[PDB]
Design a protein around this ligand. Structure first.
Ligand SMILES: O=P(O)(O)O[C@H]1[C@H](OP(=O)(O)O)[C@@H](OP(=O)(O)O)[C@H](OP(=O)(O)O)[C@@H](OP(=O)(O)O)[C@H]1OP(=O)(O)O
Ligand SMILES: Nc1ncnc2c1ncn2[C@@H]1O[C@H](COP(=O)(O)OP(=O)(O)O)[C@@H](O)[C@H]1O
Ligand SMILES: [Mn+2]
Length: 283
């Protein structure tokens, strides 16, 4: 019911996307900034981007930017890079499409996407919902991490992956996982998700394999398999040997591999995935 009301809001598209635009528009409607997509010259669907309140406080800093608190509900990242306006416009278009993917899979809440403001080409910044981190307990809050991992797997299964969360089985960036009251979210997505572009060099092919199994690396790093002696198993050894001997293939594309390794005690799996896989056999 809101689509026709949202398009009557304030059009912010020139501050984010190329103008004119046939496919996507940005509107502020009742203190909420939406992205609206079009088909056949008609508004079709929308996604929520952030809440609007239309020497900043520093929320944090990484290698490639500084994140400020624009409002109590919105964060603002200033990256160290220099690119043309069209570079950010293209990222924004892909982020909007990726936001729609997240909505259509019911996992938008687990990822903090946003848009690059480009109304000043020399003062570019990334708006996004501000989240509030709280303590992590691996046992008491295990469902939070489980639910995030399964959401990330849904992303990986579709060919998208986080650009800086778990690049390979030996690299994890836990700082990009944030626990809130209800769940775990992931940040540092101002470039959008990664995806394969059809390239066949060695690096690209390995990155695709690592990305599709990203969800597995995160889960096993936090909840590695345990043997009789309560000693953690190095899940990386069987997985690496598998990649070396099954070229250009991911474990996620082979559920029989996941179940076999899980049955042998080599890898861990979220409780619901183990249950679903085992239920697939009983039935
Ligand atoms: O009038 P605009 O050109 O559309 O810019 C406004 C303005 O931001 P700036 O003046 O700093 O550029 C608002 O800030 P206020 O002075 O009204 O407080 C801000 O609203 P927030 O307070 O929530 O930051 C809003 O941002 P939003 O997109 O969330 O509505 C943003 O609009 P633009 O996105 O078009 O820049
Ligand atoms: N949406 C957000 N809400 C609250 N804090 C954030 C948000 N995004 C980033 N931060 C803070 O800024 C820090 C740096 O974030 P960022 O630069 O995006 O990732 P990285 O440091 O991994 O490159 C984070 O560790 C976090 O504390
Ligand atoms: Mn950074």
């Amino acid at each position: 019911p809101k689509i026709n009301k949202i398009v009557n809001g304030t059009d912010l598209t020139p501050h984010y996307l190329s103008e004119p635009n046939k496919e996507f528009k940005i509107y502020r409607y009742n203190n909420e900034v939406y992205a609206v997509r079009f088909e056949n010259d008609e508004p079709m669907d929308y996604v929520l981007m952030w809440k609007s309140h239309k020497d900043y406080k520093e929320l944090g800093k990484g290698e490639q930017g500084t994140v400020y608190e624009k409002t109590e509900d919105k964060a603002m990242k200033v990256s160290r890079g220099r690119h043309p306006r069209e570079f950010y416009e293209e990222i924004n278009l892909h982020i909007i499409e990726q936001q729609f993917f997240l909505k259509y899979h019911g996992i938008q809440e687990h990822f903090v996407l946003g848009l690059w403001n480009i109304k000043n080409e020399e003062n570019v910044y990334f708006y996004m919902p501000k989240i509030n981190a709280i303590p992590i307990n691996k046992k008491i809050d295990q469902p939070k991490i489980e639910e995030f991992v399964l959401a990330l797997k849904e992303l990986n299964d579709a060919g998208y992956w986080h650009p800086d969360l778990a690049n390979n089985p030996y690299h994890i960036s836990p700082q990009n996982l944030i626990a809130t009251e209800e769940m775990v979210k992931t940040i540092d997505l101002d470039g959008g998700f990664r995806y394969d572009k059809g390239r066949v060099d060695e690096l690209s092919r390995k990155s695709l394999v690592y990305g599709k199994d990203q969800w597995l690396y995160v889960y096993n790093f936090i909840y590695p398999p345990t043997d009789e002696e309560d000693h953690r198993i190095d899940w990386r050894v069987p997985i690496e040997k598998w990649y070396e001997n099954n070229r250009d293939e991911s474990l996620s594309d082979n559920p029989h591999t996941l179940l076999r390794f899980y049955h042998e005690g080599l890898i861990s799996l979220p409780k619901k995935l183990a249950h679903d896989l085992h239920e697939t056999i009983l039935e």
